[PDB]
């Protein structure tokens, strides 16, 4: 571990990892606004016009479609000099569950 | 000292000069001190407009000669030119070309700092995002301040 | 956001009682101006004068051309083979 | 960078009491200017 | 006499040109294909 | 290079007390000039 | 050099003190006197404002130093 | 503060081009040496 007394090792390692959970995480949900929900960020319900355009959503849906139609999944391949049926072992148990 | 005159009576005799003063004094000079109240309540009305720092009298017993004028030193060179233009038709005469020229020039230089201070744009009215070139998009659609 | 934009000029005594002709109810198919005033009749003072849109200097437009072209030069490394191993041979050689 | 930019030419005399309407606020459908002043009235010069 | 309407500021229009240009730069990934890789390889290789 | 960059013409009397407007900053809604001067003054000559 | 400017401007103000008024020569010299007094003042105050608070200093220099200078007032 | 970054689609493309180019351990036999030495040397080194 990082430290002795395990509860301190968790919580102190959490402190150093707080960089991601504060500032970066705040900016990360703002991507998901412009993509999924509404174009404006921190908008209000108004009686006046609020626009949208978004060339971004057709681009995102196009890029997402490429990686889905070409999925990358477990396949396995033998080790260095190993037998050819080696891969089929671990794939046998993979495809069942 | 003497950048601002001690009393409104000293300012009055300066207008009497500009009027005739052939060893005469108009009878509209008595209403010239009253006209200071009217001039400043027409423009500089309600304590706003062209800043002069003028203070108004009770307008009962004082005719603005029983209480302080309250004029600034800078405000002297404006007022007694515009005062001389106003009491001239009241006395059934009309001001000369030098008096009306300086009257407009002193009115303008009195208002110059006021116009400059009121010449500052509003802080982002209606809408304004902070962009992603500045971290934390946060609140947007700023009405003024947010 | 800020900075005066195009709000057409008028004067108080030619829009007097005709500043209720901008209430959006459209009980009028026209606007009007004041013909005369007291003391002496006076026709509107410059009623054809209106605010004109912010142009933005030609310097801003000319500098934008130099801004986009500055990045565009170095974006190209040269081409000696299309895609891979164009101008990037110099990068790839030292890597290996 | 350093030059003055596009602004209307006015005087304090012809913008008095309506200079508050200029600041970029979108709460105005129109702006106003003085038509008269003490002594001779306001000059029509620089209306736009 | 006729009322001259706002034509939309050239400042606002010139800013809208830079607005529409800002978004479409990062939309491109170097992609030139309708499927994975083709200059978007960087995103696909880190997935595998 | 060595020939000065273009600048607007002005005169000392009309820019007096309003040199702050033409200081090279842009945060000002409008410009200000002297309408008249003393000693039988004149209108500001060509600020355009 | 500014003591023979001022009294021309003052001349036309104190000209009515017995109901007299300045001649066309006097107001000409007076207006030129006001022009001279602000002549040396206007040149000294003239100098363009610093670069914007959005303006880069570029990378065409070896060391960029300060950036995002005043433009506020 | 604006953004465009026409820099980024070009950087993404160049990163993808170098990653699809394979620079990895292979080797080749030396002067007067057996060509059967190559696979043996890679045998343990590819396992790790």
Q: Which of E30, B114, B9 is nearest to D20 (CA)?
A: B114
Cβ atoms B99, B20 nearer than 8 A:
no
Dihedrals phi, psi of D31, to nearest 5 degrees? -120, 165
Q: Does A97 touch chain H (CB under 8 A)?
A: no
Q: Which helix (H) or strand (E) holds D31?
A: strand D31-32
* Structure token digits, residue D30: 């129109």
User: Which residue's entry shows tokens 């209430």?
Assistant: C23
Cβ atoms F45, B141 nearer than 8 A:
no
Neighbours of F28 (CB within 10 A): 21
Q: Choosing among A41, A44, A47, which should be mutated to test the B contact, i.e. which has the most B CBs within 10 A? A: A41
Interface of B to G at Cβ within 8 Å reads 17-22, 96, 98-99, 102
* Structure token digits, residue G22: 């300045």
CA nearest to C2 within chain F: F29
Cβ atoms F27, G73 nearer than 8 A:
yes
Alpha carbons A53 and A29: distance in angstroms, whole number: 19
Chain E residue numbers with beta carbons less than 8 Å from the beta carbon of C50 are 4
* Structure token digits, residue A41: 């960020």
Sign of the alpha-carbon torsion through A6, A8, A13, A18: positive
* Structure token digits, residue C31: 């606007």
State which approach was used to obtain the coordinates: cryo-EM
Chain H residue numbers with beta carbons less than 8 Å from the beta carbon of A80 are 43, 46-47
CA distance G15 to chain F (A): 12
Cβ atoms H25, H5 nearer than 8 A:
no
Determine, for residues D26 and B82 on separate chains, whether the beta-carbon distance falls below 8 Å.
Answer: no
Interface of G to F at Cβ within 8 Å reads 9, 12, 27, 30-31, 34-35, 38-39, 42, 45-49, 71-73
CA nearest to F39 within chain B: B98
Dihedrals phi, psi of F37, to nearest 5 degrees? -135, 170
Alpha carbons B75 and B53: distance in angstroms, whole number: 8
Determine, for residues C56 and E10 on separate chains, whether the beta-carbon distance falls below 8 Å.
Answer: yes
F3-20 b/e (C-beta count within 10 Å ≥ 16 → b): eeeeeeebebbbbbbbeb
* Structure token digits, residue G65: 């130093």
Alpha carbons G21 and G52: distance in angstroms, whole number: 52
Cβ atoms A2, B101 nearer than 8 A:
no
Question: In angstroms, what is the resolution?
Answer: 10.5
Alpha carbons G30 and A84: distance in angstroms, whole number: 109
Question: β-strands D31-32, C9-10: how paired?
Answer: parallel
Cβ atoms F22, B114 nearer than 8 A:
no
């Amino acid at each position: 571990e990082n430290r002795l007394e395990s509860i301190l090792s968790r919580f102190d390692a959490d402190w150093t990892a707080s960089d991601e959970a504060r500032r970066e995480a705040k900016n990360d949900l703002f991507f998901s606004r412009v993509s999924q929900w509404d174009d404006w960020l921190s908008q209000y319900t108004t009686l006046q016009y609020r626009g949208q355009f978004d060339v971004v959503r057709p681009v995102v849906r196009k890029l997402v479609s490429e990686m889905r139609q070409n999925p990358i999944d477990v396949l396995y391949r033998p080790k260095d000099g190993a037998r050819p049926d080696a891969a089929d072992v671990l794939m046998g148990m993979y495809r069942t569950d | 000292t003497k950048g601002d005159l001690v009393r409104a009576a000293l300012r009055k005799l300066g207008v009497a000069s500009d009027a005739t003063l052939t060893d005469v004094e108009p009878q509209s000079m008595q209403d010239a001190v009253d006209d200071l109240e009217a001039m400043m309540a027409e423009w500089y009305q309600d304590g706003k407009g062209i800043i002069t720092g003028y203070v108004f009298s009770d307008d009962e017993n004082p005719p603005a000669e029983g209480d302080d004028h309250g004029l600034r030193s800078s405000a002297v060179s404006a007022v007694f030119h515009n005062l001389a233009c106003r009491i001239a038709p009241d006395y059934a005469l009309e001001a000369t070309a030098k008096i009306i020229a300086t009257a407009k020039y002193g009115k303008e230089l009195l208002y110059k700092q006021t116009a400059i201070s009121r010449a500052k744009r509003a802080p982002y009215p209606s809408r304004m995002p902070t962009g992603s070139g500045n971290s934390f998009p946060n609140l947007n659609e700023w009405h003024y301040f947010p | 956001a800020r900075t005066p934009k195009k709000k057409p000029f008028f004067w108080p005594e030619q829009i007097a009682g005709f500043e209720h002709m901008y209430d959006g109810n459209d009980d009028y198919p026209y606007y009007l101006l004041n013909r005369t005033d007291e003391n002496s009749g006076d026709l509107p003072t410059q009623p054809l004068a209106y605010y004109e849109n912010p142009e933005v200097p030609q310097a801003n437009a000319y500098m934008l051309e130099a801004a986009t072209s500055a990045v565009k030069e170095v974006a190209t490394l040269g081409v000696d083979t299309e895609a891979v191993n164009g101008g990037q041979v110099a990068f790839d050689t030292v890597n290996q």
